[PDB]
Every structure is written in C-alpha cells, then in structure tokens.
Amino acid sequence: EKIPIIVGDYGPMWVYPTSTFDCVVADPRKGSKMYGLKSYIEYQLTPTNTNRSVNHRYKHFDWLYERLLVKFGSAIPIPSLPFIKMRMERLQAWMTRMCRHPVISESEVFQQFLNFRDEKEWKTGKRKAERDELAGVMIFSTMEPEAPDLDLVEIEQKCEAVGKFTKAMDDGVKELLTVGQEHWKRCTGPLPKEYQKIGKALQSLATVFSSSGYQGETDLNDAITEAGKTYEEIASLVAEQPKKDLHFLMECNHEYKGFLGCFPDIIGTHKGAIEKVKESDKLVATSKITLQDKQNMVKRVSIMSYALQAEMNHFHSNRIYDYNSVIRLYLEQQVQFYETIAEKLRQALSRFPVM
Amino acid sequence: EKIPIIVGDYGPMWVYPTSTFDCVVADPRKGSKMYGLKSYIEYQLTPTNTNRSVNHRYKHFDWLYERLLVKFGSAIPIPSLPFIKMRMERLQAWMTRMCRHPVISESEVFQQFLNFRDEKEWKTGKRKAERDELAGVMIFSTMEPEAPDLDLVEIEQKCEAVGKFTKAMDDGVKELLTVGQEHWKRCTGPLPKEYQKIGKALQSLATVFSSSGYQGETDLNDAITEAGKTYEEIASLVAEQPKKDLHFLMECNHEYKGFLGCFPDIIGTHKGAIEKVKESDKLVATSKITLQDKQNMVKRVSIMSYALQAEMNHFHSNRIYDYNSVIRLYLEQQVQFYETIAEKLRQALSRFPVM
C-alpha cells in the first residue's frame, strides 16, 4: 500500500507500469453473459488484464469518484463525471483516464471496483473503502520519495509555479470553451438557417422563371433549382459539422477544466502545510508544539512537494499529447469539411449552361 | 421619331441595332482633356460610336432619369439610380443598361445628353426635352407595329400574364434580397468575430503552455500559435468575402427589383385603357363619346399591347442571361473561397509535430 515517487529526467515522478492498463466500458445487453435487464442502466467493464467483466450502475461510478476524491484528492486531480450514447462515451474516457493513472489504477479501491466476483464481495469492498482512514492529507503518509528531503525554499518555489501555471491554464481553457460554445450555437442555429433560406430563395426564383412557360430556359432554371438544393444540403452539413470536430476540441477542454478545478484545494492544502512549517520555530519556542512534531511536519511537507511535482509531470505529459492530438484532429476534420463544401458547389456550378 | 415594333420568333419585339451601343463612365481628372476640378463631382462619358466625351454632374443623371420616366414610363421600365467608387460602378451599369435599350438609346433626349458640343447646346437640349409633350400615354402615338391590330381577348390575356409574372418575380427577388442581406450582415459582423475569438483563444492557450518554461514543447506550441493566427486570417477572409460574390448577386437583384417596381404603373395604365375600350360601346350608345374616338382607343390599346410584349421580350432575354451570368459568378467565387479556407487549414495542420 506504499506509493513510490522517484526522480527522473523531469524531476519527481510516479512509477509507471511496464505495461499499459485500460478498461472497456460496454453495454451488458450485448455481452457474452446472460443478462437480466432493469432500470437502472448498467455498464459492463472489462479490464485489459482479464477476461472477467463486472457490471455497474451509474451511481456506482459516482460512488467511486467520491471515494477517489476523499482518498487521493489532496494530491491528485480526479476528472469530473459526465444522449445515452454520450454518457457511455464519457464514462469510457473517464475510466481510461483513471486506468492510466499509475497511482489510482493501483489503489485497492479502484481494483476491487473492477474485480469483485459476487455481490457479497462488492458490498464488502465498498464498506472497506468507505472506512479507509488513509484519506485527505493522511494520504501523504503512504507515499515514499526515493530521494533526499527537499528544503523549504525549493518546496515553496515549486508550489508557487504550479499555482501560477494552473491558474493561467484554467483561464485559457475557460476562454476557449466559451468562444467554442458560442460558435457551436451559431453553427447549429442561425447559420444553417441562413444557408437554408438562401437555397430556398434560389429555388423559389427558379420556379418563377419557370412560370414564363418558355421551354427554352428549362435547363437554365433546373441548374438554379439544383444550386438552391445544394445550399440546403450545405445548411445540413454546417449544422452537423460540430459533432465531428468542435465537439472533440470542447471535450478535451472540458476534461482539463475538470482537472484544473481540483487545484484550488490541492494548492490551498499545500500552502497551508508550508505555512505551518514556517510557523514551526515560533510554535516550538512557545511550547505550543514539540520538537518531534515539527520534525514530522517538515518531513510531511517534503513528501507533499514530491507528490505535487510527480502529479504535475503526469499532468504535463498528458496535456502536451492530448492538446496535440485533439487540435490535429480538429484541423483534419475542418479541412475535410471545407473541401466537401467546395466540391458540392463545384458540382452545382458544373450544371449551368454557359452563355 | 417613329418607333418600330416587329413580330419575331417570340412575338412582338423592338428593332435592335446591327451593332451594340455602349458608353464608358470615367473620372474626367484622368482624361485626355484639360479639366478644372470642382464640387460638384463629374462623370466623363464616352459613347462607343465616337471619340468625343461629355462631362456630367450626378444631378444631370437624375434629370435624365426623370426625363426618361416622364417620356417612356408608360411603356418601359427605367432602372433606378444609385463609397464613391461604388457610385461610379453603379452609374456605369445604369448607362450600359440604357445604351443597350433599342428604344431609349435612340431617343433624342438620350442622344443629346451624350453628344452636346457646348454648354449652350446642352441647356438647349435640356429645355427641349423638358417641353416634350410626347410623354406618358402619348408615347404610344409614336410607336408603329408592323403587324395586324390585336383583338381585345389576346390583349387582355397578354396583359394579365405580364402582371402575374412580374408580381411573382418581384416577390421572389425581394425574398432573395432579404435573406442575402441577412447573411451578409452575419458574415461581416458576428461570424468573423467568432473565428477571431477562437484564433485568439488558441494563441492564448499556446502562450500558457509556453509558460511551462519547458523547452521541449516549443514546436508543439508554435504550431498551435500559428493555427490560432490562421483562424484570425480566416476571420478576415470571411469578412471580406461578400464584396467578391454576394455583392454581385445582390446588385443584379437590386437592379431587377428596380425594373419590377415600374410595372404597377405600367400595368395599371394598360388595364385602365383596356377597361375604357370595354366601356366604349356603352359610352358611344349613350352619346358620351363619338365613333372615331372609340376607333382611336381601340387602335391605341393594340399598340400598347405590342409595346408591352416587345418590352417583356427585352426583359426576359436580359433576365435569363443576367441571372445565368451572376449565379455562375457567385458559385465560382464561392468555390474559390472554400478552397482557400481549406488550403489555409491544410497549411496550419502541416506544421504540427506528430506524436
């Protein structure tokens, strides 16, 4: 139950498993086990390291989320929980995020949540997890850095840096979320309505032209009619596009907003401990606390800083990769969208007689 | 001063010149004559059939517009008059529209307006035109169809058809103008602002990421920064696009709305004459009017119908060609716009490291 922290090329870091761990979130109705329906809805989970599945209602994920916050929340951001399709997709991302965390994934509570053989066993793990007193700031007593105690100057400097980065990032992420959502509303509301109105207006005109009854302008008006229909198709394409690109950019940012929202408490707790150590000389001299106690606060604050730096290294490595991946995906999809519109308009153009 | 109407493959039509007539509208400051500035602004006009130019202030075009309405308005739609660049462009279109009309272009008032040698001569043509009594419904007395008198049944049927087409077209054109203008506002207002905000939000995030101080993610963040700038460029491209396509589609429709707005008076005048002919038997029997008078109303109404059909043939041939040309141009430009955006996003994408 001890959590190692080592120092690598980026300073403090967790100990990562030699093989990646993950978990499939699926519909039990589709599984290979005989399954009796209900409400509640359940999710079937199959860890990568086993063929065994367990089922869980949504409430159980809420339960795990709280257990994880309570136990690890002083040190580790816990991602926020979430159509029905969309809930399952978000729960898969959430599970994967936790499975890939080298501390969470190894915790008794996470493992038992995924590996119980019968209802009895579940309720048993559930109660044990609910009574686990190694929680809040007590979690640090289980962590063991493989490196020398840090001095207060460095501890303070690291903490301040994390506070500054996470605050600035939170602002930047909220800005992107706000403007993206504003754009999303326009792209599914007023904008496709405009294309639709232009397209229908072209068809209306074509129909009037048709009423000249003159047979010679039939192909001319057909081409205008078809261009109007093309603009209606473009309207649908525009309205459906965000689900293919902007949605993923938004999802990644929502997830990071979720991580970032854990930092006020984490940083407050860290700064609180630093302040108490800073007071420790006065506190001792005034016989308000003993020497050994001071010793333990000093030791504890160094473990906290190792844990804080380890988690930030986890945070940054994921951050860099995730933002790179999602922004590339966003741009790829956008390229295809604009190409698609150009091609549709190209086809509309090709139908017109040349005069 | 007689205006021939002949019957061709589409029925009644004007007599078109063997060679096309046009007129360049230019800045006299740039011309080959020594020119003394002012306010008023003037426009230099050079007809295609001569090297001689005349200059005219805007007021003079207003004057010609009124002269043309007064003289020809019972039979022929007169296009409505109009940055400074934009006024000259619209005046060139207006002049060309009149130059290409086989009746207007041949009228004494139009020709003298373009061909006076000195201020004296101008004022003289101006007064003569202002006193020309062959105006309103009297214009029909100058027109001579080369074909048999039409019977009232056909006259009435043709008139009703024109009324129905022009009303339906007016509605269709106003719809396109309304929705196009709505789209135009969005494309120069809220929409480019959204792209701009997304682009700036990406750069802001890149800057935060940069603050990690870690040198290893420099190219990664550079690529995000450049994608953000690309979205700012896209914003400008979006805001500038309507001037290249939608503006021309709108201009053509504004011009046709202008023609169409002349038809209530034209049709009212035609229907008014038809009604008086329909009354002519009663009117005669009741000794309210003589036999010869009835004869002259009957003759006049047939000339009106020939003129109405001739002008509609002019209207339709231009309509078909103009809508074909402008909608093709619109689509061509739109294709290029969407291609351009796709290419810009393609370039942004190419800068990202692949992980």
Coordinates of N, CA and C in Angstrom, one line a residue, chain B residues 112-289:
Chain B
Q112 N -28.8 63.5 -77.1 CA -28.4 64.9 -76.9 C -27.6 65.0 -75.6
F113 N -28.1 64.2 -74.6 CA -27.4 64.1 -73.3 C -26.0 63.6 -73.4
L114 N -25.7 62.8 -74.5 CA -24.4 62.3 -74.7 C -23.5 63.0 -75.7
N115 N -24.1 63.9 -76.5 CA -23.5 64.4 -77.7 C -23.5 65.9 -77.9
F116 N -23.6 66.7 -76.8 CA -23.6 68.1 -76.9 C -22.2 68.7 -77.0
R117 N -22.0 69.7 -77.8 CA -20.6 70.3 -78.1 C -20.3 71.4 -77.1
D118 N -21.3 72.1 -76.6 CA -21.0 73.2 -75.7 C -22.2 73.5 -74.7
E119 N -21.9 74.0 -73.6 CA -22.9 74.4 -72.5 C -24.2 75.0 -73.1
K120 N -24.0 75.8 -74.1 CA -25.2 76.4 -74.8 C -26.1 75.3 -75.3
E121 N -25.5 74.4 -76.1 CA -26.2 73.3 -76.7 C -26.9 72.4 -75.7
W122 N -26.2 72.1 -74.6 CA -26.7 71.3 -73.5 C -28.0 71.9 -73.0
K123 N -27.9 73.2 -72.6 CA -29.1 73.9 -72.0 C -30.2 73.9 -73.0
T124 N -29.9 73.9 -74.3 CA -30.9 73.9 -75.3 C -31.6 72.6 -75.4
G125 N -30.8 71.5 -75.4 CA -31.4 70.2 -75.5 C -32.2 69.9 -74.2
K126 N -31.7 70.5 -73.1 CA -32.3 70.3 -71.8 C -33.8 70.8 -71.8
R127 N -33.9 72.0 -72.4 CA -35.2 72.7 -72.4 C -36.2 72.0 -73.4
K128 N -35.6 71.6 -74.5 CA -36.4 70.9 -75.5 C -37.0 69.6 -74.9
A129 N -36.2 68.9 -74.1 CA -36.5 67.6 -73.6 C -37.6 67.9 -72.5
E130 N -37.4 69.0 -71.8 CA -38.3 69.3 -70.7 C -39.7 69.7 -71.2
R131 N -39.8 70.1 -72.4 CA -41.1 70.5 -73.0 C -41.7 69.5 -74.0
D132 N -41.1 68.3 -74.0 CA -41.6 67.3 -75.0 C -42.9 66.7 -74.5
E133 N -43.9 66.9 -75.3 CA -45.3 66.6 -74.9 C -45.6 65.1 -75.3
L134 N -44.8 64.5 -76.1 CA -44.9 63.1 -76.4 C -44.4 62.3 -75.2
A135 N -45.2 62.2 -74.2 CA -44.8 61.6 -72.9 C -46.0 60.9 -72.3
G136 N -45.8 60.2 -71.2 CA -46.9 59.4 -70.7 C -47.6 58.5 -71.7
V137 N -48.9 58.5 -71.7 CA -49.6 57.6 -72.7 C -49.5 58.1 -74.1
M138 N -49.2 59.4 -74.3 CA -48.9 59.9 -75.6 C -47.8 59.2 -76.3
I139 N -46.9 58.6 -75.6 CA -45.7 57.9 -76.3 C -46.2 56.8 -77.3
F140 N -47.3 56.2 -77.0 CA -47.8 55.2 -77.9 C -48.1 55.7 -79.3
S141 N -48.5 57.0 -79.4 CA -48.8 57.6 -80.7 C -47.6 57.6 -81.6
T142 N -46.4 57.3 -81.1 CA -45.2 57.4 -81.9 C -44.7 56.0 -82.2
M143 N -45.4 55.0 -81.7 CA -45.0 53.6 -82.0 C -45.8 53.0 -83.1
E144 N -45.2 52.2 -83.9 CA -45.9 51.6 -85.1 C -45.6 50.2 -85.3
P145 N -46.5 49.3 -84.9 CA -46.3 47.8 -85.0 C -46.5 47.5 -86.5
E146 N -45.7 46.5 -87.0 CA -45.7 46.1 -88.4 C -46.4 44.8 -88.4
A147 N -47.7 44.8 -88.1 CA -48.5 43.6 -87.9 C -49.9 44.0 -87.6
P148 N -50.8 43.1 -87.7 CA -52.2 43.5 -87.7 C -52.7 43.9 -86.3
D149 N -53.7 44.7 -86.2 CA -54.2 45.0 -84.9 C -54.6 43.8 -84.1
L150 N -54.4 43.8 -82.8 CA -54.7 42.7 -81.9 C -56.1 42.8 -81.4
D151 N -56.7 41.7 -81.2 CA -58.1 41.7 -80.7 C -58.0 41.8 -79.2
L152 N -59.1 42.3 -78.6 CA -59.1 42.6 -77.1 C -58.8 41.4 -76.3
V153 N -59.3 40.2 -76.7 CA -59.1 39.0 -75.9 C -57.6 38.7 -75.7
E154 N -56.9 38.7 -76.8 CA -55.4 38.5 -76.8 C -54.7 39.6 -76.0
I155 N -55.1 40.8 -76.2 CA -54.5 41.9 -75.5 C -54.7 41.7 -74.0
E156 N -55.9 41.3 -73.6 CA -56.2 41.2 -72.2 C -55.4 40.0 -71.6
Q157 N -55.3 38.9 -72.3 CA -54.6 37.7 -71.9 C -53.1 38.0 -71.7
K158 N -52.5 38.8 -72.6 CA -51.1 39.1 -72.6 C -50.8 39.9 -71.3
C159 N -51.7 40.9 -71.1 CA -51.5 41.9 -70.1 C -51.6 41.2 -68.7
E160 N -52.6 40.3 -68.6 CA -52.7 39.5 -67.3 C -51.5 38.7 -67.0
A161 N -51.0 38.0 -68.1 CA -49.8 37.2 -67.9 C -48.6 38.0 -67.4
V162 N -48.3 39.2 -68.0 CA -47.2 40.0 -67.6 C -47.4 40.5 -66.1
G163 N -48.6 40.8 -65.7 CA -48.9 41.2 -64.4 C -48.6 40.1 -63.4
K164 N -49.0 38.9 -63.8 CA -48.8 37.7 -62.9 C -47.3 37.4 -62.8
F165 N -46.6 37.3 -63.9 CA -45.1 37.1 -63.9 C -44.4 38.2 -63.1
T166 N -44.6 39.4 -63.4 CA -43.9 40.5 -62.7 C -44.2 40.5 -61.2
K167 N -45.4 40.2 -60.8 CA -45.7 40.2 -59.4 C -45.0 39.1 -58.7
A168 N -45.1 37.8 -59.2 CA -44.4 36.7 -58.7 C -42.9 36.9 -58.6
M169 N -42.3 37.5 -59.7 CA -40.9 37.7 -59.7 C -40.5 38.7 -58.7
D170 N -41.3 39.8 -58.5 CA -41.0 40.8 -57.5 C -40.9 40.2 -56.1
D171 N -41.8 39.3 -55.8 CA -41.8 38.6 -54.5 C -40.5 37.7 -54.4
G172 N -40.2 37.0 -55.4 CA -39.0 36.1 -55.4 C -37.7 36.9 -55.3
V173 N -37.7 38.0 -56.0 CA -36.5 38.8 -55.9 C -36.3 39.5 -54.5
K174 N -37.4 40.0 -54.0 CA -37.4 40.6 -52.6 C -37.0 39.6 -51.5
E175 N -37.4 38.3 -51.7 CA -37.0 37.3 -50.7 C -35.5 37.0 -50.8
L176 N -35.0 36.9 -52.0 CA -33.5 36.7 -52.2 C -32.7 37.8 -51.6
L177 N -33.2 39.0 -51.9 CA -32.5 40.2 -51.3 C -32.5 40.3 -49.8
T178 N -33.6 40.0 -49.2 CA -33.8 40.0 -47.8 C -32.9 38.9 -47.1
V179 N -32.9 37.7 -47.6 CA -32.1 36.7 -46.9 C -30.6 36.8 -47.2
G180 N -30.3 37.3 -48.4 CA -28.9 37.6 -48.8 C -28.3 38.7 -47.9
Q181 N -29.1 39.8 -47.7 CA -28.7 40.9 -46.9 C -28.5 40.4 -45.4
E182 N -29.4 39.6 -44.9 CA -29.3 39.0 -43.6 C -28.0 38.2 -43.5
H183 N -27.7 37.4 -44.5 CA -26.5 36.6 -44.5 C -25.2 37.5 -44.5
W184 N -25.3 38.5 -45.4 CA -24.2 39.5 -45.5 C -23.9 40.1 -44.1
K185 N -24.9 40.6 -43.4 CA -24.6 41.2 -42.1 C -23.9 40.2 -41.2
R186 N -24.4 39.0 -41.1 CA -23.7 38.0 -40.3 C -22.2 37.7 -40.7
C187 N -22.0 37.7 -42.0 CA -20.7 37.4 -42.5 C -19.6 38.5 -42.3
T188 N -20.1 39.7 -42.0 CA -19.3 40.9 -41.8 C -19.4 41.3 -40.3
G189 N -20.2 40.6 -39.5 CA -20.3 41.0 -38.1 C -19.9 39.9 -37.2
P190 N -20.9 39.2 -36.6 CA -20.7 38.2 -35.6 C -19.9 37.0 -36.1
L191 N -20.0 36.6 -37.3 CA -19.3 35.4 -37.8 C -17.7 35.6 -37.8
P192 N -17.2 36.6 -38.4 CA -15.8 36.8 -38.3 C -15.3 37.0 -36.9
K193 N -16.2 37.6 -36.1 CA -15.8 37.8 -34.7 C -15.6 36.4 -34.0
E194 N -16.4 35.5 -34.3 CA -16.3 34.1 -33.7 C -15.0 33.4 -34.1
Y195 N -14.6 33.5 -35.4 CA -13.4 32.9 -35.8 C -12.2 33.6 -35.2
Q196 N -12.3 34.9 -35.1 CA -11.3 35.7 -34.5 C -11.1 35.3 -33.0
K197 N -12.2 35.1 -32.3 CA -12.1 34.8 -30.9 C -11.5 33.4 -30.7
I198 N -11.9 32.4 -31.6 CA -11.3 31.1 -31.5 C -9.8 31.1 -31.7
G199 N -9.4 31.9 -32.8 CA -8.0 32.0 -33.1 C -7.2 32.6 -31.9
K200 N -7.7 33.7 -31.3 CA -7.0 34.3 -30.2 C -7.0 33.4 -29.0
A201 N -8.1 32.7 -28.8 CA -8.1 31.7 -27.7 C -7.0 30.6 -27.8
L202 N -6.8 30.1 -29.0 CA -5.8 29.2 -29.3 C -4.4 29.8 -29.0
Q203 N -4.1 31.0 -29.4 CA -2.8 31.6 -29.2 C -2.7 31.8 -27.7
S204 N -3.7 32.2 -27.0 CA -3.6 32.4 -25.6 C -3.2 31.1 -24.9
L205 N -3.9 30.0 -25.2 CA -3.5 28.7 -24.7 C -2.1 28.4 -25.0
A206 N -1.6 28.6 -26.2 CA -0.3 28.3 -26.6 C 0.7 29.0 -25.7
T207 N 0.4 30.3 -25.4 CA 1.2 31.1 -24.6 C 1.3 30.6 -23.1
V208 N 0.1 30.1 -22.6 CA 0.1 29.5 -21.3 C 1.0 28.2 -21.3
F209 N 0.8 27.4 -22.3 CA 1.6 26.2 -22.4 C 3.1 26.6 -22.4
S210 N 3.4 27.6 -23.2 CA 4.8 28.1 -23.2 C 5.4 28.4 -21.9
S211 N 4.5 28.9 -21.0 CA 4.9 29.3 -19.6 C 5.4 28.1 -18.8
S212 N 5.2 26.9 -19.3 CA 5.7 25.8 -18.5 C 7.2 25.9 -18.5
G213 N 7.7 26.8 -19.3 CA 9.1 27.0 -19.4 C 9.9 25.9 -20.0
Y214 N 9.3 24.7 -20.1 CA 9.9 23.5 -20.8 C 10.2 23.7 -22.2
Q215 N 11.5 23.6 -22.6 CA 11.9 23.9 -24.0 C 11.4 22.8 -25.0
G216 N 11.1 21.6 -24.5 CA 10.8 20.5 -25.4 C 9.4 20.7 -26.2
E217 N 8.5 21.5 -25.7 CA 7.2 21.7 -26.4 C 7.1 22.9 -27.2
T218 N 8.3 23.5 -27.5 CA 8.3 24.8 -28.3 C 7.7 24.7 -29.7
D219 N 8.0 23.7 -30.5 CA 7.4 23.5 -31.8 C 6.0 23.1 -31.7
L220 N 5.6 22.4 -30.7 CA 4.2 22.0 -30.5 C 3.4 23.3 -30.3
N221 N 3.8 24.1 -29.4 CA 3.1 25.4 -29.1 C 3.2 26.4 -30.2
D222 N 4.3 26.4 -30.9 CA 4.4 27.3 -32.1 C 3.3 26.9 -33.1
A223 N 3.0 25.6 -33.3 CA 2.0 25.1 -34.3 C 0.6 25.5 -33.8
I224 N 0.4 25.5 -32.5 CA -0.9 25.9 -32.0 C -1.1 27.4 -32.2
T225 N 0.0 28.2 -31.9 CA 0.0 29.6 -32.1 C -0.3 29.9 -33.6
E226 N 0.4 29.2 -34.5 CA 0.2 29.5 -35.9 C -1.3 29.1 -36.4
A227 N -1.8 28.1 -35.8 CA -3.2 27.7 -36.1 C -4.2 28.8 -35.6
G228 N -3.9 29.4 -34.5 CA -4.7 30.5 -34.0 C -4.6 31.7 -34.9
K229 N -3.4 32.0 -35.4 CA -3.3 33.1 -36.4 C -4.0 32.8 -37.7
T230 N -3.9 31.5 -38.1 CA -4.7 31.1 -39.3 C -6.2 31.4 -39.1
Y231 N -6.7 31.1 -37.9 CA -8.2 31.4 -37.7 C -8.5 32.9 -37.7
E232 N -7.5 33.7 -37.3 CA -7.7 35.2 -37.4 C -7.6 35.6 -38.9
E233 N -6.8 34.9 -39.7 CA -6.8 35.2 -41.1 C -8.1 34.8 -41.8
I234 N -8.6 33.6 -41.3 CA -9.9 33.1 -41.8 C -11.0 34.2 -41.5
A235 N -10.9 34.7 -40.3 CA -11.9 35.7 -39.9 C -11.9 36.9 -40.9
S236 N -10.7 37.4 -41.3 CA -10.6 38.5 -42.3 C -11.1 38.1 -43.6
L237 N -10.8 36.8 -44.0 CA -11.2 36.3 -45.3 C -12.7 36.3 -45.3
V238 N -13.3 35.8 -44.3 CA -14.8 35.7 -44.2 C -15.4 37.1 -44.3
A239 N -14.9 38.1 -43.6 CA -15.5 39.4 -43.5 C -15.3 40.1 -44.9
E240 N -14.3 39.8 -45.7 CA -14.1 40.4 -47.0 C -14.8 39.7 -48.1
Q241 N -15.3 38.5 -47.9 CA -15.8 37.6 -49.0 C -17.0 38.2 -49.7
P242 N -18.1 38.7 -49.0 CA -19.3 39.1 -49.7 C -19.0 40.2 -50.8
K243 N -18.0 41.0 -50.6 CA -17.7 42.0 -51.6 C -17.3 41.3 -53.0
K244 N -16.9 40.1 -52.9 CA -16.4 39.3 -54.0 C -17.5 38.5 -54.7
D245 N -18.5 38.2 -54.0 CA -19.6 37.3 -54.6 C -21.0 37.7 -54.3
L246 N -21.4 37.7 -53.1 CA -22.8 38.0 -52.7 C -23.2 39.5 -53.2
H247 N -22.2 40.4 -53.2 CA -22.4 41.7 -53.6 C -22.9 41.8 -55.1
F248 N -22.4 40.9 -55.9 CA -22.8 40.9 -57.3 C -24.2 40.3 -57.5
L249 N -24.4 39.2 -56.7 CA -25.7 38.6 -56.7 C -26.8 39.6 -56.2
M250 N -26.5 40.3 -55.2 CA -27.4 41.3 -54.7 C -27.6 42.5 -55.7
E251 N -26.5 43.0 -56.3 CA -26.6 44.0 -57.2 C -27.6 43.7 -58.4
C252 N -27.4 42.5 -58.9 CA -28.3 42.1 -60.0 C -29.8 42.1 -59.5
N253 N -30.0 41.5 -58.4 CA -31.3 41.5 -57.8 C -31.9 42.9 -57.5
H254 N -31.1 43.8 -57.0 CA -31.5 45.2 -56.8 C -31.9 45.8 -58.1
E255 N -31.1 45.6 -59.1 CA -31.5 46.1 -60.4 C -32.8 45.6 -60.9
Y256 N -33.1 44.3 -60.8 CA -34.3 43.7 -61.2 C -35.5 44.2 -60.4
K257 N -35.3 44.3 -59.1 CA -36.3 44.9 -58.2 C -36.7 46.3 -58.7
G258 N -35.7 47.1 -59.2 CA -35.9 48.4 -59.8 C -36.7 48.3 -61.0
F259 N -36.4 47.4 -61.9 CA -37.3 47.3 -63.1 C -38.7 46.9 -62.7
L260 N -38.8 45.9 -61.8 CA -40.1 45.4 -61.5 C -41.0 46.4 -60.8
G261 N -40.4 47.3 -60.1 CA -41.2 48.4 -59.4 C -41.8 49.4 -60.4
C262 N -41.5 49.3 -61.6 CA -42.1 50.1 -62.7 C -43.4 49.5 -63.2
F263 N -43.6 48.2 -62.9 CA -44.7 47.5 -63.5 C -46.1 47.8 -63.0
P264 N -46.2 48.1 -61.6 CA -47.5 48.5 -61.2 C -48.1 49.7 -62.0
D265 N -47.3 50.7 -62.2 CA -47.8 51.8 -63.1 C -48.1 51.4 -64.5
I266 N -47.1 50.7 -65.1 CA -47.3 50.3 -66.5 C -48.6 49.4 -66.6
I267 N -48.7 48.4 -65.8 CA -49.9 47.5 -65.9 C -51.2 48.3 -65.5
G268 N -51.1 49.2 -64.5 CA -52.3 49.9 -64.2 C -52.8 50.7 -65.4
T269 N -51.8 51.4 -66.1 CA -52.1 52.2 -67.3 C -52.7 51.3 -68.4
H270 N -52.1 50.2 -68.6 CA -52.6 49.3 -69.6 C -54.0 48.8 -69.3
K271 N -54.2 48.3 -68.1 CA -55.5 47.8 -67.7 C -56.5 49.0 -67.8
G272 N -56.1 50.2 -67.4 CA -57.0 51.3 -67.5 C -57.5 51.6 -68.9
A273 N -56.6 51.5 -69.9 CA -57.0 51.6 -71.3 C -57.9 50.5 -71.8
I274 N -57.6 49.3 -71.3 CA -58.5 48.1 -71.7 C -59.9 48.3 -71.2
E275 N -60.0 48.8 -70.0 CA -61.3 49.0 -69.4 C -62.1 50.1 -70.2
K276 N -61.4 51.1 -70.6 CA -62.1 52.2 -71.3 C -62.6 51.7 -72.7
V277 N -61.8 50.8 -73.3 CA -62.2 50.2 -74.6 C -63.4 49.3 -74.3
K278 N -63.4 48.6 -73.2 CA -64.5 47.7 -72.9 C -65.8 48.5 -72.6
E279 N -65.6 49.8 -72.2 CA -66.7 50.6 -72.0 C -67.2 51.3 -73.3
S280 N -66.4 51.2 -74.3 CA -66.6 52.1 -75.4 C -67.9 51.9 -76.1
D281 N -68.5 50.7 -76.2 CA -69.8 50.5 -76.8 C -70.9 51.3 -76.0
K282 N -70.9 51.0 -74.7 CA -71.9 51.8 -73.8 C -71.7 53.3 -74.0
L283 N -70.4 53.7 -73.9 CA -70.1 55.1 -74.0 C -70.6 55.8 -75.3
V284 N -70.4 55.0 -76.4 CA -70.9 55.5 -77.7 C -72.4 55.6 -77.7
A285 N -73.0 54.4 -77.4 CA -74.5 54.3 -77.4 C -75.2 55.4 -76.6
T286 N -74.5 55.8 -75.5 CA -75.0 56.8 -74.6 C -74.5 58.2 -75.0
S287 N -74.0 58.3 -76.3 CA -73.6 59.6 -76.8 C -72.6 60.4 -75.9
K288 N -71.9 59.6 -75.1 CA -70.9 60.3 -74.3 C -69.5 60.4 -75.1
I289 N -69.4 59.6 -76.1 CA -68.2 59.7 -77.0 C -68.6 59.3 -78.4

